[PDB]
Homo-oligomer: 388 residues x 4
Amino acid sequence: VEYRNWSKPQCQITGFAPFSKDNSIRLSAGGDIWVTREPYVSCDPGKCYQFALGQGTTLDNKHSNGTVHDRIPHRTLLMNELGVPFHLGTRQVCIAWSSSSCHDGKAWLHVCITGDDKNATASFIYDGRLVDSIGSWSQNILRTQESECVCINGTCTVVMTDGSASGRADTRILFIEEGKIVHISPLSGSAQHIEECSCYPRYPGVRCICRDNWKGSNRPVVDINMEDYSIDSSYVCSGLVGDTPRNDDSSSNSNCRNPNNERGTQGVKGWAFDNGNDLWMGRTISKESRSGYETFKVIGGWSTPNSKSQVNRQVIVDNNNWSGYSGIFSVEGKSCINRCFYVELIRGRPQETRVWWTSNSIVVFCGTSGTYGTGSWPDGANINFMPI
Amino acid sequence: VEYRNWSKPQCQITGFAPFSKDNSIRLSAGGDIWVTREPYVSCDPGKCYQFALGQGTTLDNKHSNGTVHDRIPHRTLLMNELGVPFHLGTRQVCIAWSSSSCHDGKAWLHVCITGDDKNATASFIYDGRLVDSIGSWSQNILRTQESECVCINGTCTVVMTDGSASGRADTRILFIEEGKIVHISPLSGSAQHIEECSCYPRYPGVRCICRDNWKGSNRPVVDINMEDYSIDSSYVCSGLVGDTPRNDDSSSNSNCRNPNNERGTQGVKGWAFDNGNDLWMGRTISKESRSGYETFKVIGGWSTPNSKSQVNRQVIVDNNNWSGYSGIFSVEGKSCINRCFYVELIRGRPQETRVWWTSNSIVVFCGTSGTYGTGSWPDGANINFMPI
Amino acid sequence: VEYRNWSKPQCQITGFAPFSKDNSIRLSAGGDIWVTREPYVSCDPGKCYQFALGQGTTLDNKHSNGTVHDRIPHRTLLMNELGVPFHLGTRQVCIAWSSSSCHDGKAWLHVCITGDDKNATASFIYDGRLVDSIGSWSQNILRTQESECVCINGTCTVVMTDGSASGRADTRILFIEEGKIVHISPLSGSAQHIEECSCYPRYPGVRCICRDNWKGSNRPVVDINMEDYSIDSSYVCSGLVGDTPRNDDSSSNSNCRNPNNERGTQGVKGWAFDNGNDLWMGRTISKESRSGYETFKVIGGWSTPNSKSQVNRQVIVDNNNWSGYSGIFSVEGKSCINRCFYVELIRGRPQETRVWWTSNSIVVFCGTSGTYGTGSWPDGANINFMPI
Amino acid sequence: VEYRNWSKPQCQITGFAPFSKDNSIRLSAGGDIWVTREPYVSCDPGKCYQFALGQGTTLDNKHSNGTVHDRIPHRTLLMNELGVPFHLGTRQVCIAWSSSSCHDGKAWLHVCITGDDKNATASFIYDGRLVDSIGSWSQNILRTQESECVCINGTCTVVMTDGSASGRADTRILFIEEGKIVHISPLSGSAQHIEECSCYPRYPGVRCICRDNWKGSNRPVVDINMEDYSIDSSYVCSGLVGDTPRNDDSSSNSNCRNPNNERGTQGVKGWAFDNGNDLWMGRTISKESRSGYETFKVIGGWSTPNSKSQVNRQVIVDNNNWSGYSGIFSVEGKSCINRCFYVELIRGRPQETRVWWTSNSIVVFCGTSGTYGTGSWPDGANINFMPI
Ligand SMILES: *[C@@H]1O[C@H](CO)[C@@H](O[C@@H]2O[C@H](CO)[C@@H](O[C@@H]3O[C@H](CO)[C@@H](O)[C@H](O[C@H]4O[C@H](CO)[C@@H](O)[C@H](O)[C@@H]4O)[C@@H]3O)[C@H](O)[C@H]2NC(C)=O)[C@H](O)[C@H]1NC(C)=O
Ligand SMILES: *[C@@H]1O[C@H](CO)[C@@H](O[C@@H]2O[C@H](CO)[C@@H](O[C@@H]3O[C@H](CO)[C@@H](O)[C@H](O[C@H]4O[C@H](CO)[C@@H](O)[C@H](O)[C@@H]4O)[C@@H]3O)[C@H](O)[C@H]2NC(C)=O)[C@H](O)[C@H]1NC(C)=O
Ligand SMILES: *[C@@H]1O[C@H](CO)[C@@H](O[C@@H]2O[C@H](CO)[C@@H](O[C@@H]3O[C@H](CO)[C@@H](O)[C@H](O[C@H]4O[C@H](CO)[C@@H](O)[C@H](O)[C@@H]4O)[C@@H]3O)[C@H](O)[C@H]2NC(C)=O)[C@H](O)[C@H]1NC(C)=O
Ligand SMILES: *[C@@H]1O[C@H](CO)[C@@H](O[C@@H]2O[C@H](CO)[C@@H](O[C@@H]3O[C@H](CO)[C@@H](O)[C@H](O[C@H]4O[C@H](CO)[C@@H](O)[C@H](O)[C@@H]4O)[C@@H]3O)[C@H](O)[C@H]2NC(C)=O)[C@H](O)[C@H]1NC(C)=O
Ligand SMILES: *[C@@H]1O[C@H](CO)[C@@H](O[C@@H]2O[C@H](CO)[C@@H](O)[C@H](O)[C@H]2NC(C)=O)[C@H](O)[C@H]1NC(C)=O
Ligand SMILES: *[C@@H]1O[C@H](CO)[C@@H](O[C@@H]2O[C@H](CO)[C@@H](O)[C@H](O)[C@H]2NC(C)=O)[C@H](O)[C@H]1NC(C)=O
Ligand SMILES: *[C@@H]1O[C@H](CO)[C@@H](O[C@@H]2O[C@H](CO)[C@@H](O)[C@H](O)[C@H]2NC(C)=O)[C@H](O)[C@H]1NC(C)=O
Ligand SMILES: *[C@@H]1O[C@H](CO)[C@@H](O[C@@H]2O[C@H](CO)[C@@H](O)[C@H](O)[C@H]2NC(C)=O)[C@H](O)[C@H]1NC(C)=O
Ligand SMILES: CCC(CC)O[C@@H]1C=C(C(=O)O)C[C@H](N)[C@H]1NC(C)=O
Ligand SMILES: CCC(CC)O[C@@H]1C=C(C(=O)O)C[C@H](N)[C@H]1NC(C)=O
Ligand SMILES: CCC(CC)O[C@@H]1C=C(C(=O)O)C[C@H](N)[C@H]1NC(C)=O
Ligand SMILES: CCC(CC)O[C@@H]1C=C(C(=O)O)C[C@H](N)[C@H]1NC(C)=O
Ligand SMILES: [Ca+2]
Ligand SMILES: [Ca+2]
Ligand SMILES: [Ca+2]
Ligand SMILES: [Ca+2]
């Protein structure tokens, strides 16, 4: 077994093809299934796994009540093979109300954060054993990506924030070797707020498209140099912006450098990736709510400030259905590195008040160099059929 | 580990022996079990797996209502070890309302089709990663075998159709290497409608017995040359015909070349294979409905137009019990390739209206060179005991 | 991987120590657990497995009603790791209302019998594929051991009967190489009725202690020569007899050669094994009913007709609790071959009529060369707590 | 694979970081989950497992009633991967109402005790087979650690007691090679009552901190010489004592040599380990009841009689929540041996009488050389939501 380097070109793609779906909520109405949120996907060199933050309860369970709330001590990181829904034999990998995981070619790293808001602990578990930990540096909800971290030549990197969710905060980039923090770099460059980064290998570095929860409806970028630990940051050029909320397409803007101050407050975890001057990205279809999900390529979306010319759109979830978080994961093929993504499909609170819980299912698509058609792959549960 | 060649002679058989049965529907009345249809079996070089298309729900579950419907976004391909029923720990391999899977000696290939009727997408997943995709070429429900594909020396072939289910359609034969489509051949020969092929290795090529849903109650054949990608097609010679509906045995015909125009419209997935001039086949016992199941050898059934002399009959399911689809799968032995088959045992709608769902169990038999007796192995559930 | 020879001396033991217990019926009252009977245990070179004949249903399931009946097409052979109860993820290895399984050092053989009483089929599955089959030779419930078969140097042997359960029948001993029947020997010697043999390796041969369901409350012996396929048979010498029903200890007899004609009709599967002139054996505590279970060594119990001197008794299940079948299995240690045994603990019908099902749990003990105390390890379920 | 030696230095730690939590009781209100108590954790060289003693029943199950009782024949040792809750697919490793397990680098050893109070049997299962057994030597509830044993160079040691729980008893130290007892050493030194030892490797020997249930609220120590089998014993020097019940910190004493005769009778399983002259320990926060849990380092707590200066305290469970047993386990790192611990979180009887069962969940922490914050990780179930 060898370390992953991801030293292959990115796969040239034409769009995305359907890959997985777990039907969690449909199943929860006739089965013992975990209440979750903040899912993601990551693969070792052989196979893929779905992850999510449990709420220490199943859905058909009185403990499901009140699970809209983000942080309790009972939240743990669930990890199954992709497509295996979160049944009672699911392994709870660690204690976490925020997490990130990645495989370095040899073993799994999990970054797991739990404890008091003002004084949380992040544990670093590598190859099944606790190797390191770090306490909160700003005493205000230490937190991380809620998607996969990225490792090159045995060094994994992960982005963490501590501080205000609606103002300047303290963001740092950790470099981790076999679970041991070997270096920490502060955020640097022009991004002014970093949450929930969706990162991906871009040899010889790592690149993240994140969420600005303060002043930007355009998505921040963080670039991580794995050779000298230097950090840069900016914003996605595309004038078709990825965050929710956001201005409609005719009145939205980005200059690649600063937050746009267009319905900038709040956000949703998301992703995009560069292809030369172009940008593949996803976002919700609704500009104000976490409804629908669409992908497309923005021509000049990486290089050209305020580009709004798109091509190769695909509906993933139609705008009559709830979406939520989305993130990227990368998969090594024979000659190139492919990009895939997942979409969290949130059911229950706050939008659907018939029930007293909040949970999600997922749908997963991968990059393709072939052809495809159309469809819509929503959660599929009838809210009226669910235990409340 | 090496690529399968299947370069051994076909096992000489005297009939078939009982192999597996999952009791899905009986279990569903006291357990959380997936609603399914369109099952099949395929084995890697070590062990066998059962597959089926889930309906994104369990049976004792209000989402079971309306599962007679064929195509929804929530259908996924389930894969367990043969004999493990579809419990909540079952892995959803991909998104699929039509599928085919096969193992090439090294890894699994799954062909999974989902999306809009008029614009579907087929994903090609090999060794746990999406390698290729293709969109609909006739904008009318792109679809495939619902049984195993076949691979020789690293090339796997699968048969797909797009177009009318009651008229001329567009059928193509794909050749796939490690998930990557390397060549596509149009249907050629005298078969005029091809659905749901049951294929098997017949070194150096592959042979399929399929379903003609337009003008034939006799079963089409498709022969696939793996060396030059050429295709040929015809119909099963036997005057004892395998489709349902069909004429009774006294007024049924086949000339090996054309659809017989005898109750030709509609059909059911099925199988047969050749042994020299003779034919082993199965079919429903009823000639109008999907009731019962029987196998037999037809003397001259492969080489002689309209042969009706059978021998070595076996009841698999008696005619008081519901059957459904059936397909072949091949298992490599020490010195020969054996042929096995599965029968889908459909319960619920449209035949049984006490319940509002449609699901199935399976029963599985393998060729034997030994001896055997008699029996009947139906689904076994009491419809009156089921959740509605 | 090499073939097992079992060419080590038998472990000298002082009694038996507790090994496993599955609590199936206690669990069935709050969980989805298979209805079973006819359990047994067998181990490959690394680990042990429990087996049982399912009834194609869980206990808390209306299909549980009527499961006192022995043979339906829905019965299949369940196989889990020992101590894993029969939950919904249990693999159904084959179709069987009677079975035997063993591992030859390389792979598992399963002998599975199903179909019509008058014309049953036995399938032989080796290394996950059907290799052979045989039909009924006397048209009267072809049947086998309901415990492990035994393999030496790649040849597995198994004892099967076809014919009357209350009169002379047709018993044959099969020799099976990688699932292929290479030879069949008729029963020979003085045993006049053979059912449900508990066999064990006794290098260079195999020895079985079985059940006489016609004229003997003493247990028949069958000796199998694996070098030339010759068969011998007799009866256990011990005047403390192993079958149920039987005469009380003061009025019971055996002469090592003929059935004793003492409450000979009926029986229960059981076991014993020789140690020089002595005999270790188990039986129910009740002489008339399947209640309690006890083991002991009978001094001269193998060599001396009608010996009644016992030593080293142990209660396994007290006589206030239901037992059932019991059988032997052998486990290779570093220098010797150990003998273990299981006891089936039957709950429900016919004895307990509050419920309409019949099922069992198991308890398992292994030979020890150390010391031990006392106890009683019954099923433990409160019949009044069970779904009916 | 090689025998563990544990010949690395103890990891220098600053405290403990969150590692795992199973949420057993919360899940039990919407799922079929085993009733347990007496949990622990032990890891093979690759991964960690949670263990516990089942009560032969699930919680939502009428057999849960009366599970406050300690010893029944239906108790079995459960073993899952750490983080997998005790669902119906959990393996019952052996019959046990008291146990200890450990992995010697090659295979697992389980020590399992069951049977009559006055005449119990301990089985020694190694590598999936029963290798040895021993009967009770004092006819008064033979019993062992309820946490992991320790193996160095192929010899595993475990501490057992037989005799009064409120008076002088007979304690012995067994040395076991591949399941076989090779030597037994009587307790020696100044410890006067030894229960439920929490042992750890301290190369070249093993050290245990145990429970004195007769006259000590301070914790006994047992030191085991693996080279010559000699034993020594004493008490933990720290004047901050670890047992419950105990005197408050102002009136508590220990002289390192004798039980302190301060609320000495009764107790609770616990742990501590030395680092030079200092002591890391945990205990309940309440001094009279099994409520809360806290850890801290005591400066001079190992070497200095009656030291009461603590540093680096951490709340694990706050004093509004129920705790219970706790024990140590050791995890080998790249360059040092780390110490982790688990806390049993007892719910139901005797403290919570709304329900008629007694069960537990766990929370697990591992030593860290990094930093951390604060929190509280209790069981988390609402007793009012539970099945009674
Ligand atoms: C069958 O499926 C195929 C593949 O999905 C599908 O082809 C795709 O159609 C879409 C929609 O036309 C194309 O994406 C568009 O590209 C144009 C540039 O030529 C853009 O202008 C579009 O964006 C505008 O329109 C969108 C609405 O469609 C708005 O949401 C958006 O804000 C813009 O105003 C859009 O990006 C896509 O390129 C093709 N894909 C390929 C590979 O050709 C085809 O249409 C389907 N057939 C049928 C009959 O439905
Ligand atoms: C015990 O089991 C064995 C094995 O199953 C069984 O032997 C089989 O019997 C069947 C039925 O007789 C044989 O199959 C027949 O073969 C003749 C040709 O010799 C055909 O004519 C038969 O077809 C006609 O009859 C069918 C009804 O049986 C009709 O459905 C059909 O349309 C035809 O008109 C049929 O193919 C078979 O060959 C044997 N198998 C062997 C290996 O001998 C035996 O009968 C069983 N005995 C009992 C008492 O159950
Ligand atoms: C603690 O446990 C140990 C180990 O189990 C136990 O020692 C065993 O006691 C039994 C019962 O006495 C012994 O078995 C007996 O052996 C004598 C020969 O000396 C036989 O005569 C006995 O058979 C007769 O009695 C039985 C009732 O006990 C009848 O059921 C039977 O039909 C006969 O009439 C019986 O075989 C056994 O040998 C010892 N085992 C050892 C290793 O010594 C001990 O008794 C237990 N201690 C207490 C206080 O319970
Ligand atoms: C954020 O988290 C960190 C890490 O947990 C935390 O720092 C820790 O605080 C505790 C409490 O002050 C420190 O532990 C104490 O150490 C002093 C000696 O310097 C002892 O006197 C303390 O014991 C006394 O007080 C206890 C109550 O706190 C009593 O229970 C006890 O009986 C004694 O009278 C105690 O051991 C600990 O050393 C630090 N850890 C580190 C690494 O600095 C910090 O306080 C947290 N901040 C907030 C705002 O939550
Ligand atoms: C879920 O919990 C909520 C909050 O505790 C419950 O809602 C409360 O119900 C009480 C009881 O009548 C009311 O008096 C409160 O005003 C409600 N609170 C709120 C915020 O609405 C609710 O009943 C629980 N639901 C279920 C299904 O158990
Ligand atoms: C399954 O779904 C069907 C269709 O929705 C339900 O049948 C309908 O029930 C409504 C009232 O609830 C009637 O007004 C319609 O006439 C019914 N439709 C048909 C076509 O019969 C049915 O109730 C559902 N079944 C269950 C068990 O919930
Ligand atoms: C289990 O099945 C049995 C047999 O079908 C049922 O017993 C019968 O019940 C009917 C209905 O009242 C009676 O008329 C018959 O006389 C009963 N038969 C016998 C043999 O006693 C029984 O009710 C079913 N039990 C359950 C729990 O479903
Ligand atoms: C759990 O078991 C207890 C003890 O059997 C039950 O309490 C007894 O109930 C009976 C009547 O059913 C009373 O006469 C006794 O006085 C009760 N005993 C005690 C000690 O209180 C209790 O009902 C059972 N609990 C449940 C939930 O079934
Ligand atoms: C605490 C700040 C943070 C980033 C904006 O809030 C997130 C947003 C929430 C989201 O907008 O739905 C869900 C996340 N569970 C939450 N993360 C944590 C650790 O609580
Ligand atoms: C759409 C044509 C096709 C071939 C006849 O219909 C099939 C027949 C159906 C029926 O004959 O049972 C079941 C299949 N689910 C359906 N396949 C799809 C993809 O919908
Ligand atoms: C059919 C004869 C046979 C041996 C006496 O009966 C067995 C006895 C029964 C037993 O006495 O309880 C149970 C077995 N399930 C049955 N075996 C079969 C195949 O039905
Ligand atoms: C029997 C003495 C022993 C040591 C104090 O009691 C333990 C204490 C009990 C209690 O302190 O929680 C729980 C244990 N289940 C019990 N062990 C056994 C084997 O019954
Ligand atoms: Ca924003
Ligand atoms: Ca047709
Ligand atoms: Ca008899
Ligand atoms: Ca004490």
